[PDB]
């Protein structure tokens with residue numbers, strides 16, 4: 001079925017939980033043996049969220065190459081993403097090692113450091129220009145260059161230096177700051193505006209390594225971001241945009257990381273975002289919306 005009318009049909013019939021459970025039943029199950037080794041227990045935030053062996057990102061280290069991070073490679077859309085958990089106190093150096101080794105331009109953060117009164121990830125970037133961070137275990141230096149705070153998100157320019165070679169690179173930090181502590185946003189408008197800002201920066205483009213995207217576990221909000229992006233790109237590429245099947249795209253992405261989209265509310269929100277986004281992209285869109 002098409003998307004917008006399949007959407008109204010699920011709303012009127014109140015069957016979002018059944019649709020979502022079907023996805024959970026059909027999703028791939030692949031081994032994650034490296035994640036479960038005893039030496040990696042303090043490298044995982046949640047015992048039930050692990051990268052598959054076949055798609056995990058390897059650190060370029062001979063002692064321990066493990067990080068909780070997965071490469072999602074979308075062949076028809078020609079986009080790749082790295083989805084990862086929010087960094088832990090003992091993995092902030094590994095996180096920036098991955099950004100460096102994979103040649104990423106951008107980091108997309110979809111959570112706040114504290115939510116619901118508990119810590120959801122480490123404070124892994126510097127908050128003041130004159131107070132840089134040094135990660136001694138991986139030999140990297142990280143400096144805040146500039147910060148632009150807007151009503152729904154903040155963008156930061158960061159400098160990452162490999163202290164071994166003295167090479168430097170500019171990294172862009174895109175921080176969506178207004179996802180509610182409970183549930184999903186009422187409107188997808190600010191989330192879509194944010195997606196378009198990430199796109200406009202070059203961070204998703206083939207001349208760079210894959211974007212790194214995270215929330216707390218790296219499967220829920222993070223899954224919503226890459227699912228919406230890929231579906232909108234496919235609607236632009238294909239002769240028949242109504243052929244894009246969001247449930248089939250989600251199952252393809254779940255071949256590369258478990259658990260993407262954590263609730264039926266997140267599934268409904270993803271449909272809403274793609275539906276509204278497809279109108280702004282256009283044939284029915286103004287030439288001037290790219291400025292909206």
Ligand SMILES: N#Cc1ccc(N2CCCC2)cn1
Pocket residue numbers: 193196280281289290291292
């Ligand atoms: N190309 C392009 C494009 C399309 C839409 C767009 N947005 C609509 C809402 C504000 C930003 C931006 N750029």
